[PDB]
Design a protein around this nucleic acid. Structure first.
Ligand SMILES: [Mg+2]
Ligand SMILES: [Mg+2]
Lengths: 56, 142, 193, 99, 216, 136, 43
RNA sequence: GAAGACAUUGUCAGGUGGGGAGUUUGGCUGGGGCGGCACAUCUGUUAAACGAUAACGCAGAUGUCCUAAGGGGGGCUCAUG
RNA sequence: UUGACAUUGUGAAGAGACAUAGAGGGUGUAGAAUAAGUGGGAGCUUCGGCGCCAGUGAAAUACCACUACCUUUAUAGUUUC
RNA sequence: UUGACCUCAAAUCAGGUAGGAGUACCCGCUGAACUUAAGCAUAUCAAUAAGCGGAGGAAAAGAAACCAACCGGGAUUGC
């Protein structure tokens, strides 16, 4: 929360996503496709480790 | 100078252009008349050499587009450590400033250096940024 | 546009200049009405001389300081040396300027002398009685003309002592030019321990 | 300051005998009177300090007169007003230290 | 230049005063410049590398090996410098323990233009890992002259650590020579460095078995 | 604040040097328009002066002094009966108050050569072509 | 006709540019699907 | 009641902005357009044995290269058979 | 649309960043050991001991300094969130 | 309870005053483009035309927070 360009995102969640529950949150991020992006970023970390393992 | 002007009609396929201040290499050129009376317009589709993105621009044919200077240079590997290649020039000069490739080219180069071939690396210079594009093996002078 | 060998002209007539054209057809009639105004003013102030007394005073710049001319009014120091107050001088017809100063004794003495001659020449009437009529003149400036002072006599003896008056001017310009660098060198020489 | 008699140089001009006229009273407009000094001291006692003057007091106490003059030059208009303001604030610091 | 010549002269004076008179050491003491650069990133910024040849040698006696051909070895007999031939390098047969022993034996290497191609093929990349890579020499040039040159080389290369160090010279040299060499080395360092004299973190002069002295 | 140019949808219909809408400034002062509105409110009075009292982000606050030229205490009292002369009707509308002369630029000096006797008067005076009977 | 709408004109009735319009668009431009997160018929 | 020193408002600053404004969109030319450059130049010829001389005449060329491929001196003679 | 300043006052906590005063800290394996790296260094010694040749390890060890990264206290501190 | 003060009102309260016209000249605000640049965007036209507010026989300005640099001048206006 002390890295650059995070408080600009944190303002919008207080503005429009204050009254929300986790079922709706999961539904909306699944309907907007950000969850697939998070999954692929963690996957890219997994092949980053995995390629080093195959090299060894 | 680093870059020199050219005409759109003077450009042709497999040549370098500057599109949005990026060195790009053309894959497609198409000219269509604007109006029956008017001059034709050139639609250019090109690929950035460093990043691989596809960039297109359309212009008048008489318009002048910017063209980079691209130099391809031949070197021998010394070591691959920390993502930075170390190369060796003819007359014995050495550079370590080149970063290692990050794709399947970099993976194949890493495996080839691990299993011990003598690798010939082609690195290109265009507009002050440097990268490696391809590697071969020296068939003679082992 | 540009043509044969002629000088480059600059005629500023690109606005609507024909809307502002003043032709002085009324020069002669304006002069006649101006003389009529002077005569009716003189008849209105029938003993008084139609203009105030002005001091002699030295013209400002280096182009014109060789000449002397008329000022706005006398200095308060000048009228106190003449021996009358500023309010009384304004009532008896002397222009007083509260904002000029006396730095020149010759100009001061000339203006004091001029006030003395004016006080000798005028007649001041009593405020109540007889009014002994006295046939006005119309120009205090013409009765007290401004005279250029005689600066020198027309024949003298030659006093030559070998400086040529060109070396003097050149040396004065040179020492003005190299003044401040010499005190700079003197200051650093003094503070050199 | 007498003239030299010649047309150029340091003191160029014609030598005329001077008069040194009486001083004008308008030349002493900015002179401080006893009554206005008393009024200014009393209202300074009554009103105290403005916020920029308080933070200037902190700048002489902590960061020195150079940073104090830089901040006062930014705050007021000119460097002259900044120097006078820092000087009078240093006087307030000395007087309050005596208090 | 933020650093001034008179300050360099002063700091050199107490440095040589401590090294020579007060606590003399039996081994000859090398004067070291240790630098640290500021607001710089090894990963993103360009990795600067450069070399300069000092007029008077910092290290006259440092061990150097010449990889060389027949002509180079025959000249190296006259030069008096240690050499192994291409046949000797083939003998070595890419054995890691012995080539590591050679790398710790010799600080500097000089190789011929012909054989500099297969110096990596016979020896491998552990020379580039150590940072001692052979310098090219030709048949035309003088080997002993280039030995003096390599012994007087000063090299700045970024690598990964944001602090560098070079050996300006000996304690035993004359004061003006030491001042001139440290000044030209600082000037060469800031010439290689981008945004010069502001990405200089710290400059330290020291002598071997001596305390540090800080020049800005 | 500024004076927004009153044009429909910002279209000025001219050369690009006149396309500015937002950052344009009114040539008179807020003190001037304040006392002019006060004079329109009390047209039977005469505006003498005005002074600042307060402000915030939205408004500036002025107090306007006005004198009644029909009251006998101002018809008499020769120090003030000059305001009863008909040449002083709406001095604040003609720019004859203190801030009006400040905004018109009426001051002595070399810094006021454009505006010293009236800007339009000087412009007419130095754009007039003067021809005499005997042409000089 | 193109004087009357962004979609007007052409020798065939077609939109031309994309019909999804930015939320930061101005009056006279917001004609179409304003700030659409997705389009099309989902199944 | 709600909200609260945050919105709002004012002034600057960055982004976005054919919704709108203003303007531009070469020349030669066996009509214009496409093509070409005959648009700044160089060699030979047309060219009519001084000089000059046209066509979208013919055959070509230029926007470079060279610390020697510049300057001086010495020695030697080349292609080919 | 975004930021700053003003409107704009009154109170508490919790983090973070600098200045300059000082502290300690670094364990894949192998290797006598806990190898942050660099650079010098063949002699330094206070013990006549530690390095050096030699072992292992990418990196070697005394004796010197430097630079990061960490944790760590304090200022009539400077500040931001 | 009574009498003040402050502030704010109401009266077909006593007496007054403003509006509109004219607008050649005057004092301000606001404000173009045609045109010229042989094109055109800064510029020019022009601190103009059109629009709005306000006076008088004139208006405005006016008795230095001036000009100067000289041996200094001395409100404003006009030629
Ligand atoms: Mg407004
Ligand atoms: Mg359409």
């Amino acid at each position: 929360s002390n890295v650059r360009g995070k408080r600009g995102k944190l303002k919008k969640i207080q503005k429009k996503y204050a009254d929300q529950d986790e079922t709706e949150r999961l539904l909306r991020l699944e309907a907007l496709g950000t969850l697939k992006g998070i999954e692929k970023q963690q996957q890219r970390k997994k092949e980053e480790i995995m390629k080093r393992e195959v090299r060894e | 100078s680093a870059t020199y002007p050219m005409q759109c009609s003077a450009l042709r396929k497999n040549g370098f252009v500057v599109i949005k201040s990026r060195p790009c290499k053309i894959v497609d050129m198409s000219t269509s008349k604007t109006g029956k009376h008017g001059h034709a317009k050139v639609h250019l589709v090109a690929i950035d050499i460093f990043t691989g993105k596809k960039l297109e621009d359309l212009s008048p044919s008489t318009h002048n587009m910017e063209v980079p200077v691209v130099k391809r240079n031949e070197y021998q590997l010394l070591d691959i450590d920390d993502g930075f290649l170390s190369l060796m020039n003819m007359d014995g000069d050495t550079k370590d400033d080149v970063k290692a490739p990050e794709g399947e080219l970099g993976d194949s180069l890493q495996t080839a250096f691990d299993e011990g071939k003598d690798l010939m690396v082609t690195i290109i210079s265009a507009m002050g940024e440097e990268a490696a594009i391809s590697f071969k093996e020296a068939a003679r002078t082992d | 546009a540009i043509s044969k060998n002629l000088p480059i002209l600059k005629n500023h007539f690109r606005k609507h200049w024909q809307e502002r054209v003043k032709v002085h057809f009324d020069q002669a009639g304006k002069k006649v009405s101006r003389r009529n105004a002077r005569a009716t003013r003189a008849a209105k102030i029938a003993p008084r001389p139609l203009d105030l007394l002005r001091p002699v005073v030295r013209a400002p710049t280096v182009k014109y300081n060789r000449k002397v001319r008329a000022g706005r009014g006398f200095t308060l120091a000048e009228v106190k040396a003449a021996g009358l107050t500023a309010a009384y001088a304004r009532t008896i017809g002397i222009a007083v300027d509260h904002r000029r100063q006396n730095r020149n004794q010759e100009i001061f003495d000339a203006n004091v002398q001029r006030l003395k001659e004016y006080q000798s020449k005028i007649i001041v009437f009593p405020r109540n009685g007889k009014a002994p009529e006295a046939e006005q003149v119309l120009s205090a400036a013409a009765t007290f003309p401004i005279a250029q002072p005689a600066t020198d006599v027309e024949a003298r003896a030659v006093q030559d002592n070998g400086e040529s008056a060109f070396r003097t001017l050149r040396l004065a310009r040179s020492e003005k030019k190299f003044r401040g660098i010499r005190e700079k060198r003197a200051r650093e020489k003094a503070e050199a321990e | 300051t007498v003239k030299t008699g010649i047309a150029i140089g340091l003191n160029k001009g014609k030598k005329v005998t001077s008069m040194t006229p009486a001083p004008k009273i308008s030349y002493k407009k900015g002179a401080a009177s006893n009554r206005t000094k008393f009024v200014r001291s009393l209202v300074r006692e009554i009103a105290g300090l403005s916020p920029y003057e308080r933070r200037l007091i902190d700048l002489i106490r902590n960061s020195g007169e150079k940073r104090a003059r830089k901040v006062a030059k930014k705050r007021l208009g000119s460097f002259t007003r900044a120097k006078a303001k820092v000087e009078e604030m240093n006087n307030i610091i000395a007087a309050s230290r005596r208090h | 230049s933020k650093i001034t010549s008179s300050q360099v002269r002063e700091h050199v004076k107490e440095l040589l005063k401590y090294s020579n008179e007060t606590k003399k050491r039996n081994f000859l003491e090398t004067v070291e410049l240790q630098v640290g650069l500021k607001n710089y990133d090894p990963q993103r910024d360009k990795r600067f590398s450069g070399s300069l040849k000092l007029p008077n040698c910092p290290r006259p006696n440092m061990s150097i090996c010449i990889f060389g051909d027949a002509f180079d070895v025959d000249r190296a007999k006259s030069c008096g410098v240690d050499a192994m031939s291409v046949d000797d390098l083939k003998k070595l047969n890419k054995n890691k323990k012995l080539i590591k022993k050679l790398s710790k034996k010799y600080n500097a290497f000089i190789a011929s233009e012909v054989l500099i191609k297969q110096v990596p093929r016979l020896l491998g990349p552990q020379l580039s890992k150590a940072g001692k890579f052979p310098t090219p020499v030709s048949h035309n040039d003088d080997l002993y002259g280039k030995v003096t040159d390599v012994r007087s080389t000063i090299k700045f290369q970024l690598k990964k650590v944001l602090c560098l160090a070079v050996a300006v010279g000996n304690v035993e040299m004359e004061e003006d020579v030491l001042v001139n060499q440290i000044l030209m080395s600082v000037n060469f360092f800031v010439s290689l460095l981008k945004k010069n004299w502001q990405n200089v973190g710290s400059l330290v002069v020291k002598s071997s078995m001596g305390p540090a002295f800080r020049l800005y | 604040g500024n004076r927004k140019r009153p044009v429909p949808k910002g279209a000025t219909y001219g050369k690009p040097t006149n396309q500015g809408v937002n950052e344009l400034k009114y040539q008179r002062s807020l003190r001037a328009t304040a006392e002019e509105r006060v004079g329109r409110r009390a047209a039977n009075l005469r505006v003498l002066n005005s002074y600042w009292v307060n402000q915030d982000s939205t408004y500036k606050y002025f107090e306007v002094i006005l004198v009644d030229p029909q009251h006998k205490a101002i018809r008499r009292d020769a120090r003030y009966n000059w305001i009863c002369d008909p040449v002083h009707k709406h001095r604040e509308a003609r720019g004859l108050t203190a801030t009006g002369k400040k905004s018109r630029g009426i001051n002595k000096g070399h810094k006021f050569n454009n505006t010293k006797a009236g800007r339009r008067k000087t412009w007419k005076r130095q754009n007039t072509l003067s021809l005499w009977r005997y042409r000089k | 006709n193109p004087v009357d709408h962004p979609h007007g004109g052409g020798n065939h009735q077609h939109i031309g540019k994309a019909s999804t319009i930015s939320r930061g668009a101005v009056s006279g431009q917001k004609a179409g699907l304003i700030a659409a997160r997705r389009t099309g018929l989902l199944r």
